[PDB]
Structure formats: structure tokens, C-alpha cells
Amino acid sequence: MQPFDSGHDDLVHDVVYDFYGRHVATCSSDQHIKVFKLDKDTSNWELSDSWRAHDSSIVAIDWASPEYGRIIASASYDKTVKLWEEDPDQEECSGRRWNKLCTLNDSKGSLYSVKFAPAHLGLKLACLGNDGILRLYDALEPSDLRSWTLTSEMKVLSIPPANHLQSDFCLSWCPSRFSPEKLAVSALEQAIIYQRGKDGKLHVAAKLPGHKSLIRSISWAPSIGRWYQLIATGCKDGRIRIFKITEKLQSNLQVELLSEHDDHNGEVWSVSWNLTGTILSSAGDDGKVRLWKATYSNEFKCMSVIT
Template identity: 40%
Template sequence: MNQVTKFDGTHEDLIHDVAFNYYGNRLATCSSDQKIKIWDYNEADGIWESNISFKAHSCAVLKTSWAHPEYGQVLASCSFDRSVIIWEESYHDAVKKWTSVATLRDGSGTVQDVEFAPNHLGLRLAIVAADGLVKIYEAMDVTSLAHWTMIDSFPVGEGPSKDEDGNHCLSWCTSKFTAQMMVVGCAKDHVAKIFRQDHNTKWQACEVLGGHGGVVHDVSWAPNMGRSYHLIATACKDGHVRIFKLTDDSQGGALTGGWSRKMFNVTCIADFADHNAEVWRVEWNVTGTILSSSGYDGKVRLWKATYTGDWRCMSVVSAEEGPSAFQR
């Protein structure tokens, strides 16, 4: 692992999130300066350039999520100002411009996480706010994104939370062959829960990922890649990165999405305390083979399974001073 390049984010305050688009040739950065910046990769020169910066919200912009490119260049942002805004890139006199096409503002707390649903579910967006409600919106017409309808809403725990209780966070299951599911980090409850749409299209909690010794700061559902099981990673305040394995509890294995079966066998297959500090973020790569975790120790760790199914740390990126060259 090498540091191959860097660029100045040029925000006037701390960055909260950086999100690659579907192809990885665009980046969106958002910050407490209330702005979003869009960066394009200049392949010829190998550099990241930003020509677009816009004030997105009236408070800190906490997260951004790109929609699948078949809906165009569409970005959703959530903010401390309790709103979610859908942005679309358009051309005005051959000049690219990002326009706010819809604002979703019906919550009673900071919107803490936003994520577009996997493409096979259509243009849908899940958000979770400090009030402990997950809401799912859908664009009525994918060629005109002005109208979004809230198609579902469900609480993640018992009673509302406060911002101080920590983050709510969510991650969709991207498998095409199961019922709609997502994992949600439930702030004060110190657990993550699997929510699944039942046969009445109601979202129900069907599993609890327990064993956390603090607030679950982040969750990430691994792309399935034809495996007969699911992997979910959690980042916890107790300093642990955990990987949970979900297998169908019926004999025979495959998750075929049958409505009659709803429970999984959940096992924690990896539990790492290497960060030795609160773990803030976890994320899988696009094929669900590498997990990244980052924490208050100023380090990003990359985890990969060996062929024996053991998860091992393969790389560490440190924010501390040290030899910049590659070490092995």
C-alpha cells in the first residue's frame, strides 16, 4: 500500500464525508462549512480537480450518497439542519450546474445517515435521523426527480434518541435474491438490527447483532457476491470492529428470499480490538472482500479473509508521523 496522491479539499471547516460515485471517477466532499464540493478525476494528469462547490445546507453537511448512474448524476446529502436534499447535475449553456431538485424535511432530528438503495430496488433512498426513525423515499418518476414519496418509515428502537446518544447509521443489503433488508445501528441501544420487509411489505426487525459494549457508530453490509451467507461489519465505541455472518437458519442454506423464513443464524466471526480506541467507520469494497475500519487512533485498517476464513489485517494507514515509505 502506498500513498499515491493527495489533494487539498479546500473546505473552510472539517470534512464530514467523502463519497465516490459509482465509477470512482468523481468524488463528493461535504463539510461543516455547509458546502458540497464535486471533484473530477483528470485521468491524463492523474489529479483530482474541483470546479464545483455549492452551499448545500444551512448547517453542517454530514453525509452524501450517489445514486446509480442510470438515474443521471444524482447526489443526496443530509445535514444537521434536519433535511435531506437531492441534487442533480444539469447543463445550463454547456456549463455543469448542481441543482437542488427536492428537499425532504419531515423529521424532528438531525439526519445522521443517508444511502440510496441498491439499483434493483429502483430510485429509493433510506435516511435515519436522530429521532430514531428510518424513512424510505422513492422517486415517483426517475426522469424527473422533483417528487419523492415516503413509502416506509419505522423506528429503530424503543422511543426517540437524542443526538448525544450517538449516531444512527444504516446500510442496505445489496443482494438481488433476498427480500429487502438493511442493517441499522441503533445508537443508545448499543446494538445493530437487521430490518427486513415482511410479506405485508412492512419493515420488521428480524435479528439483533449484539455483543457491542457501546454505541454502534457505523454498520456496513457486504455485497453478497453469490455467497450463501451475508457479512455485516460494525464499528463500535467499545473499540471493536466486528464481522457478523448471517446464514439462513433452515437446512439447505441458500437465502432464496422465501417469505415464510425470516430468521438467520448470526455468528460473530471476527472481533478485533486493534484500534484500541473508538471505531468510527467501517466500509466494504465493491466485491465485499476487503473491509476498512477507521478509528480514534488515527488509523485506517484494512481486513481481508484468508482462504481458511480467518480475517487478518493486511494494511494500516496512519495519520501519525512516521516513515512515509512503504513498509513490509
């Protein structure tokens, strides 16, 4: 397990694992999307395919559930979202292994994030950009992976000032299968949660208070076994935060802060979870990655520090 070159000329923004953890998707500013394969025999990562996919810098990426095929989604500063499907009848590295299935141009501002929804809701996805408007899209007919309709539009931010390079937005759905549809969203200093109502519309069901700067990352944790939800955030103020959300101003959702950690002394850029939501990861300025486990008391403890 030695490092390897991505093949990108410009800085790389996101790396994402497929469902089985045997594949990886990379997107960079050189407007390319690379897909790597983990060869069974020689336990090495080797490029499956690379290709130009956008006219501008590609910032976000994500894989759809395997029960819908081999599908990747990308978000770029070119105000669009593109969908791709792997065509197994093409040579690897040919640049023609992934066919565009559609393009979403509804956004009138650059896009910073795109996340597929939990499989138990169909091919669904969300995106957020400069326009401060979250959008949900649905592939209503699972046969037509081109039939992408717009399911919803919500104004997250209300008055985004026309003079700020300092912009960040993040998304993360609640993975939980036995919990009402809902997703988390970060916008600058704010971080708010949306929940599906009885009326099939998104409503703000709560906010995660405490952030005193820009939220670089957020991710909802798999609540396998638990009755509550946990979402972590990596802020620019140098703090990792872990919130406990239970459902028992108009909410049915409670919000606890479980932990805060400044161990990074600088901005926390990446926050990620286990497949079981048993381990939480964090990375930042100090050039270190930290792994966290939960105590018996539900506090969180650093079980190791990689560098």
C-alpha cells in the first residue's frame, strides 16, 4: 500500500469509494474524472479510466447504489451536474468507458457538492452551489437513467453578497433506512437539517449551532444499531463537532452536542465515517488524520493518529 500518482495536472478535490470499497472515483480542476480499480491479484490500485467531463473545475463526486448499476455523478464550477454510467463493453483507459447519461443545468451558480440519496428512496440526489439553492433530482423511471426530473428546490441562504471568494457548502443524507427521509446541509457558518414532511416537501427541522467560522465538511453517520443520529462537522475554527440528534421551533427533532475537538490546531478539512458508523475520521492543517471511537458514556475518544 504505497502512494501512487492520480494522473491529474491540477489539484484534486474529492475522492470517493464505491459501495464495495474496491473502486475509487477522483475529480480534479484539470476537468477530469478518473476511476481506479483494486486489482485482486496484485493488491495495487490501477487506473480503470480517465476522461474529461466538465468545462470547469470538478469539485464533487459520488457513486450510486449498485442496485441501480454503475453510476457516478459530478458537480463542477461550470454550474452543472453530470451523470455517468459505466459501459463494460469498452477497454479500460480508453476514455470512453463512461457515457454521460444527462446534464443538470438548473443551477445558476457554480456547484460545490452532490450526493446520491439512500437506495431505499430510489435514484435520488441533491446539489448545492453559489445560488444558495439546494436541489433534489429523481430518476423516476429506474429504466430511463436519463429521465432526471427536478424533485425539489429550497433556499438555504437568503442573501449571498456578490463579493466573496470565501464560500463553502456541503451535503450529507441520513443513511438510515428505518428513519424518515432527511439530510444535512452546511452553508458558510450555518448548518441546517431538512426533513421530509407529510406533504412530501422539505422543511427545516433543526440547526447545528456552535460553528464560529466556515464549515469545511459534514457527514451523517450510519445509525446501525442506534435509535439516534450522529452528524459530525469539521469547521475552519479548528474544531471537530459531533451532534446527537434524537426525534421524540416546530421540530420533532432534538439536538445535543456530544463532542468538540481542537486536537488539529487549525482548520479541519475532512470528516468521514465508518461503514458501520463505528469510527469517525478527521483531517486538517496539522497534516494529520485522527480516528475516533465512542466511549461507553457516548463521549468520543481518539483511538489513533496517522500522519
